[PDB]
């Protein structure tokens, strides 16, 4: 059941509830975790496993303002306090490694340069920059030569995550960012070895996960994927073929887990992968687990508004709704001031 302990690769989890990666845009100077962030995560450490907010491996890979990094010592040292705070509550925390690719803005990029991508095709989405929402910039298609360098930024970012006391990492292979831009033909128009087929489109994602897995162990490596894009995501002519291939290859690398943002056949992916499946509601989630479809279930917004989400799912206490206006940016308010259940109600 949802509330009983389990293991993920090496580590041991108090329960099967995962806190999904949620961007909050509250990092400080130098993309170092802001001073309240340790608290934020420790408040939610009753989660079996926390996946951190997406965290850029380089400034090139930054796409939203005030998201944190994992590439300078300042950031590492900021993260140590957070891993410590989580661990002192008996918790687990994995860092989600990020490269946004074309989902960025010149204002965030080194020297005002153009964001990078497999092909020079702008995304039709906005980002949060200069304290407002603006269309993402036109990207530059990456030279074949640069790719090994990006694989190495992930490699190095994984070893920085271990320095910082994380229990492992999660490669961000989803939600329209760099590695998915390569994976999906809606955005990968290349004709070299990193495009033009299932196997080529899939090459960067697999190279990145293979390098991360070698650096730190497959047992501390996970990846997130999202086979079916939303309406305004990346077009993908045949995601089933694409993601059956990718999961076959991921399973071959021996990695601890896949994290799937869920007409598509997930049972195929589930079958192909021989370790943990993290799927991304209490009672359907329970059936989903009972049914053998997943091993862990990741909840997103509910963890924003209910720090005691695990306890409330277990007791039946009603859940607090999110203040949506305070998710991204700002202060303690709508971040660390969400009450636990006893501090929410009036008897009369």
Describe this structure in words.
By secondary structure, the chain is an alpha/beta fold. The protein has a single domain (1-348), classed as Aldolase class I (TIM Barrel). It is 30% helix and 16% strand. The strands form five sheets. An eight-stranded parallel beta barrel has the order 3-6-8-13-14-15-16-17. It has a two-stranded antiparallel sheet with strand order 1-2. Strand 10 (126-129) and strand 11 (132-135) form a beta hairpin. Helix 3 packs parallel to helix 6 (203-216). It is globular and about 65 Å long. The chain starts with 5 loop residues before the first strand and ends in a 33-residue tail after the last helix. This is Glycerol trinitrate reductase. InterPro entries: Aldolase_TIM, OxRdtase_FMN_N, Oye-like.
Task: Write a short abstract of this structure.
Belongs to the NADH:flavin oxidoreductase/NADH oxidase family. Helices cover 30% and strands 16% of the residues.
